[PDB]
Paper text:
[name] is a membrane-bound lipoprotein and a core component of the type VI secretion system found in Gram-negative bacteria. The pro­pensity to self-associate using parts of the SmLip structure that will be exposed in the periplasm suggests that this protein, exploiting the lipid anchor, helps to bind and position different components of the secretion apparatus at the outer mem­brane.
The structure is that of the globular domain lacking only the lipoprotein signal peptide and the lipidated N-terminus of the mature protein. We now report the high-resolution structure of SmLip determined following phase determination using single-wavelength anomalous dispersion (SAD) measurements based on the scattering properties of iodide ions. The refinement proceeded with the release of NCS restraints and the incorporation of water molecules, an Na+ ion, ethylene glycol and a number of side chains with dual rotamer conformations. However, we did not assign any chloride ions to the structure, noting that typical water molecules occupy the previously identified iodide-binding sites. Molecule A consists of residues 32–173; molecule B of residues 33–142 and 147–176; molecule C of residues 34–50, 53–143 and 147–175; and molecule D of residues 33–50 and 55–175. The asymmetric unit of SmLip is a tetramer with 222 symmetry, but the assembly is distinct from that previously noted for the transthyretin protein family. The accessible surface area (ASA) of the SmLip polypeptide averages out at approximately 8350 Å2; the range is from 8200 Å2 for molecule D to 8510 Å2 for molecule A. Each molecule in the asymmetric unit interacts with two of the other three and two types of protein–protein interface are formed between molecules A–B and C–D (interface I) and between molecules A–C and B–D (interface II). The type II interface covers about 6.5% of the ASA of a molecule, a level typical of the values observed simply owing to molecular packing in a crystal lattice. This interface is formed by the antiparallel alignment of two β4 strands.
Residue numbers in the entry: 32 to 173
The structure:
Amino acid sequence: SVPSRYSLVFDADRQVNAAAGAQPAPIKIRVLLLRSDAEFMDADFFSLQNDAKSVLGNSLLDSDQFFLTPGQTGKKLGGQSALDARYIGVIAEYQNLDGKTWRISLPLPEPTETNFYKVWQFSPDELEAHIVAGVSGLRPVK
């Protein structure tokens, strides 16, 4: 709500998501709007994949998804935030889950940090982050 929307721009490594002996394969990315990330960071992969709302309950505000092709750069997904949104959760459904960072939680700013809007009323109100789906997992870019 303040700011009102968000977006994530995704790059995927050319070698992302290639099993032993197999070619790199598109990977499913989910983006979840969250009231809190506690249940999200604790839930097991299957639970989140098969029924996120059940395992997350009231903590899940919204969710969206897309596929990312190995080597693809600058693929953007965004949506509207909500007043009580505190985190964006990101899940990457790697075929070989072991040792991969297949989930990340990104904290949204709190009241303090978006204070500038009452005075700077016309500043852009879309938060943007950049994520890479890498061979070892998801990581934000500096």
